[PDB]
Design a protein around this nucleic acid. Structure first.
Length: 109
DNA sequence: TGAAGTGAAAGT
DNA sequence: ACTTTCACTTCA
């Protein structure tokens, strides 16, 4: 699975709290984006999606690899921003709240 | 304060 | 088809 299909599956699964569809037609989604220095940040919940992508691509096995959620986060961020399959919609990305999240559009084709 | 984050560019 | 690295900035 490429990143677009993989993330579609992760959003649909509802297994990551706050990683969910922004609108009814499922063209837009929210991705939780909590700053890791915050009190209430928990890696097991807040870094789990980034972790999953790293493991899905073989870029982290618990054992060979230092577990660095900051490098998991940047990897997904750079992947999202570089691919023509996605577009960040900063207008509805709400980063000032308690469960802050970014919004992305998924481009079809 | 030092950790965590970033876009841009260089990278495989 | 994404990934890694840089200087520099932003965060709590």
């Amino acid at each position: 699975m490429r990143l677009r299909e993989w993330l579609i599956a992760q959003i649909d699964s509802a297994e990551y709290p706050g990683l969910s569809w922004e609108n009814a037609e499922k063209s837009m989604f929210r991705i939780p984006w909590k700053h890791a220095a915050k009190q209430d940040y928990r890696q097991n919940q807040d870094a789990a999606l980034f972790k999953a992508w790293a493991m899905y691509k073989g870029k982290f096995q618990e054992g060979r690899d230092k577990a660095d959620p900051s490098t998991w986060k940047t990897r997904l961020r750079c992947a999202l921003n570089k691919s023509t399959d996605f577009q960040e919609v900063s207008e509805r990305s709400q980063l000032d709240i308690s469960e802050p999240y970014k919004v992305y559009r998924i481009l079809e084709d």
